[PDB]
Ligand binder design. Structure first.
Ligand code: HEM
Ligand code: HEM
Ligand SMILES: CNCCN(C)c1cccc(CCc2cc(C)cc(N)n2)c1
Ligand SMILES: CNCCN(C)c1cccc(CCc2cc(C)cc(N)n2)c1
Ligand SMILES: C[C@H](O)[C@H](O)[C@H]1CNc2nc(N)[nH]c(=O)c2N1
Ligand SMILES: C[C@H](O)[C@H](O)[C@H]1CNc2nc(N)[nH]c(=O)c2N1
Ligand SMILES: [Cl-]
Ligand SMILES: [Cl-]
Lengths: 362, 362
């Protein structure tokens, strides 16, 4: 049944890929080649062109992503050649460096060797390459609660965090044939961070808030034509609300709204004062202003939505069906001020795509 | 097929209704009574108890409603006795008066005679009993664009609006056996309106914004045990965002955000200033403050969400399945600050319920 799923997905992908690349004539011969290769080997190997466009298609098909207008400019790094943990480590370091690009962020994906018999060659434990640790000791909460389980797992393995609110987790990944993952401390010179200040409220710095420049999702599986690239970290730049309305705002994340309200000089006593809404807006203005002042790429939700509208138009013009997840596409602040809120989207799953996979910790 | 649908819905409703009312023993005899009555007459007549609880159940099952915690205190007015347009008119006037209750708003439904052969006895044209007219003449826009078609239909029938931005539409409804609807101007003494001022920004009054006190939906069909009450207007009190984030804010409604930005003294030039978000918050604070200052009931979205959480808990405790429409339940500002945003809801349709029906204009 497995070779049949593989052959079916391969047929669907190669036809669509080569059609998009103006290479429809080469489909019959390549499919034959793949057909023999699956028979003989149990799998097949993508060409560099196929892998690159496949990763691009996968981004284009990501229903929950508002940033898809730029799917075709994704920078794809082919690291199917890696065999050692030093090489994985250095590829991860390189990804951070090149994607960060001194603040002028480049959407980038690094692709590691894929699963064979469903056997992972490389298994990345981080949720993002750059993320903050989280601790809970006797009701004492430090750092990012969403990182609590991974942080605990790292500390099993001999890492120890300084227990600041912004400890950088180390990189942590397991190689095929190893029972335990290894971990490496991130070089601080690789990691851009942005202190959060407000454009007119000087007291905002008293909060001592900061966030990292580049969100690099590293625990999703990329699927292209039946090949499972379980290890394929990717990044864009942030939309400001991700940091301002969620990471810093959620009660189960950093939970900063009461402290924001205090420094901006409003009471946090009555629901009818809409103090949470006012604090959300100021904190979100602060995030945007801070990233821009530092020369680190970021987009606001209004501009992002305008871009997504162009993606929608672009899709219809190319004759492609559009898919989307309305519940993830709407921004978590002023969603009704975007066009997204006022239409609906087909949430069908089209491949290639990025998919969740099980945590090896927890 | 129709008598079978009716008998099936009747069986489902009577069992559930009498079960809730502790009257399970009376189910067999009442079902027999209904069974004979459908056979003989082609329909059946609800008891006052059945109608009241049915309307309450219908509210409880309304997936899109955040205000359902108070389903059981709905004030049900039985007007199945009306036969003339004067009686319909006076029942509508009375509904406005009693629901308004000097500002201390009572959730109320008035139930008119139901469809017979799918033949309406009374057909209400208004979307809400109290709503503002809308005009578009040569790119000139006045009033509420959502009312444009109904306004045009009224003006066919000899009504003429003053072409203020806040003309009250007249009541308009058609009686069975009449080819045209009649219309009646609303007595201003029946209609509470609230001028929009801001708690600290005195200039906000320069916008000359106002809204009506009581939203009375009058174009939905109430369905109870197979009986179609196509004419059954109902009301609650407003959640502030309905007015502040939608009615006054949407580009295709009153579109006031640029003018809000100006009076609150911020520029409306750059998306990264989040001026739309800041204006939304201030306008929404203004709406809440204005209703409260006048003694007209209203709820903010935070309190409403807290109440809805109690509805959820209340449902589980009573052993009832909960249904909801996540996309309508989340408020259009700071949705991620409510618990609603962070869970999911089963959007199944359970009856009794309120349903859309076709506009007789358009
Ligand atoms: C270029 C800048 C980008 C922006 C501004 C952007 C924006 C977003 C946002 C706001 C989300 C919602 C995430 C959340 O609420 O947690 C998202 C989800 C997502 N984005 Fe993008 N994105 C960008 C680039 C990319 C790239 C380069 C990829 C992959 C090649 C990608 C794939 C995804 C996926 C898979 C999700 C859903 C993840 C999940 O289900 O948890 N995006 N994007
Ligand atoms: C008591 C105060 C109430 C509040 C604060 C409230 C709140 C809301 C809100 C905010 C909506 C969304 C509407 C929109 O965005 O256009 C809504 C929808 C709805 N509410 Fe309520 N509601 C209340 C009372 C009632 C009552 C008394 C009924 C009926 C007996 C009702 C039935 C509904 C229905 C049917 C909808 C959906 C209408 C549609 O699909 O267009 N609600 N409610
Ligand atoms: C509710 N828990 C959500 C955790 N998940 C699944 C999650 C957490 C953080 C971030 C994401 C995707 C965010 C993202 C990814 C990329 C490439 C760019 C961007 N701007 N945001 C997803
Ligand atoms: C997108 N067009 C939406 C028009 N609809 C369907 C609409 C328009 C206005 C109002 C509603 C329901 C609003 C409502 C009803 C009641 C009883 C109370 C309340 N607070 N809100 C629904
Ligand atoms: C098509 C889309 O779902 C539509 O804009 C919905 C979104 N959720 C909503 N929610 C509420 N409360 N009111 C609305 O009118 C809408 N519109
Ligand atoms: C269960 C519920 O759908 C969940 O809270 C979703 C809502 N939409 C979202 N949208 C974004 N962008 N990010 C999220 O984490 C979520 N969470
Ligand atoms: Cl993030
Ligand atoms: Cl309304």
């Amino acid at each position: 049944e497995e070779k049949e799923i593989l052959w079916n997905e391969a047929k669907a992908f190669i036809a669509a890929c080569y059609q998009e690349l103006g290479k429809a004539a080469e489909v019959k011969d390549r499919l034959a080649d793949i057909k023999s290769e699956i028979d003989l080997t149990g799998s097949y190997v993508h060409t560099k062109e196929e892998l690159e466009h496949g990763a691009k298609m996968a981004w284009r098909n990501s229903n929950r992503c508002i940033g898809r207008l730029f799917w075709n400019s994704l920078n794809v790094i082919d690291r199917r050649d890696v065999r050692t943990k030093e090489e994985v480590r250095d590829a991860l370091f390189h990804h951070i460096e090149t994607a960060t690009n001194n603040g002028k962020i480049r959407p980038t994906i690094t692709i590691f060797p894929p699963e064979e018999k469903g056997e992972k060659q490389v298994e990345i434990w981080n949720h993002q390459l750059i993320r903050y640790a989280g601790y809970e000791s006797d009701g004492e909460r430090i750092g990012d609660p969403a990182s609590c389980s991974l942080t605990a797992a790292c500390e099993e393995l001999g890492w120890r965090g300084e227990r600041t609110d912004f400890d950088l987790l180390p990189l942590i990944f397991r190689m095929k044939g190893d029972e335990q993952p290894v971990w490496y401390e991130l070089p601080r010179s690789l990691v851009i961070e942005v202190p959060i200040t407000h454009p007119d409220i000087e007291a905002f710095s008293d909060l001592e808030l900061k966030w990292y420049g580049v969100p690099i999702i590293s625990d999703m599986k990329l699927e292209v034509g039946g090949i499972h690239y379980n290890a394929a970290p990717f990044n864009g730049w942030y939309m400001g609300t991700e940091i301002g309305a969620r990471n810093l705002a959620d009660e189960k994340r950093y939970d900063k709204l009461k402290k924001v309200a205090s420094v901006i000089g409003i009471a946090a006593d009555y629901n009818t004062d809409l103090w949470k809404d006012q604090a959300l807006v100021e904190l979100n203005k602060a995030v945007l202003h801070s990233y821009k002042k530092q020369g680190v790429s970021i987009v606001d939700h209004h501009t992002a939505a305008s871009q997504f509208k162009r993606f929608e138009e672009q899709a219809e013009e190319a004759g492609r069906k559009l898919t989307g997840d309305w519940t993830w596409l709407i921004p978590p602040i002023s969603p009704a001020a975007t066009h997204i809120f006022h239409r609906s989207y087909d949430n069908s799953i089209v491949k290639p795509n990025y998919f969740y996979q099980d945590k090896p910790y927890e």
